[PDB]
Amino acid sequence: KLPPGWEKRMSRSSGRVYYFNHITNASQWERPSGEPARVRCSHLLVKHSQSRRPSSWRQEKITRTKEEALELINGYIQKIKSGEEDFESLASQFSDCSSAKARGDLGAFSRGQMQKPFEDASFALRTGEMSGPVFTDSGIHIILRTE
């Protein structure tokens, strides 16, 4: 009896059930509570040496590995979930996408327009909800659905 894309999982380190979304890679302790033509999202992108365009306003030659990019992504997720940092502030400071200028805002879009893994996570999110790591050809994303 779980919303779309959510499933119950067992955590081995703590021995407790949690909830996992296999579309967004979101996870949380708490049980989670047509689809629209368009959603609005912000994101924080961390590129790596195998991104389709491995450079950004933050560095001319992006050399980090995929797993280094994932480590940075998880660090940002930790700070956001714990309240140590705001999503928008981290996107402005550290996103490798030029949308960092607008605090990660990408505006509105509909299915078919974005990269498929990005689109699926975005439409699987509920408004105000945040994804886990989402992998695309651009790099690794954190996605926040704002409308």
Q: Which candidate, 119, 116, 107, places its Cα nearest to that of 35?
A: 119
Active-site residue flag, 56:
no
Burial, 20: exposed, middle or buried (Cβ in 10 Å; 0-12, 13-18, 19+)? middle
Sign of CA dihedral 128, 91, 119, 77: negative
Active-site residue flag, 41:
no
Catalytic residue among 41, 42, 43, 51: 43
CB atoms within 10 A of CB 18: 15
C-alpha distances out from residue 137 to 43, 49, 75, 97, Å: 15, 11, 21, 13
Structure solved via: X-ray
Active-site residue flag, 22:
no
Complete DSSP assignment for 3-44? -TTEEEEEETTTTEEEEEETTT--EESSPP----SEEEEEEE
Q: Which candidate, 146, 73, 67, places its Cα nearest to that of 106?
A: 146
Q: What is the dihedral of CA 129, 100, 82, 126, to 10 degrees?
A: 0
As given in the structure block, the two tokens for residue 87 are 């999503």
Query: Rounded CA gap, 1 and 31, in Å?
Result: 10
C-alpha distances out from residue 14 to 29, 32, 98, 147, Å: 11, 20, 39, 34
Query: Rounded CA gap, 34 and 31, in Å?
Result: 22
Active-site residue flag, 115:
yes
Helical ranges in the chain per DSSP H: 66-82, 87-94, 116-124
Strands 134-136 and 105-110: unpaired
Catalytic residue among 41, 42, 97, 131: 97
Q: Which domains does the chain have, with CATH numbers?
A: 1-32 (2.20.70.10), 38-147 (3.10.50.40)
DSSP, collapsed to helix, strand or coil, labels residue 119 as helix
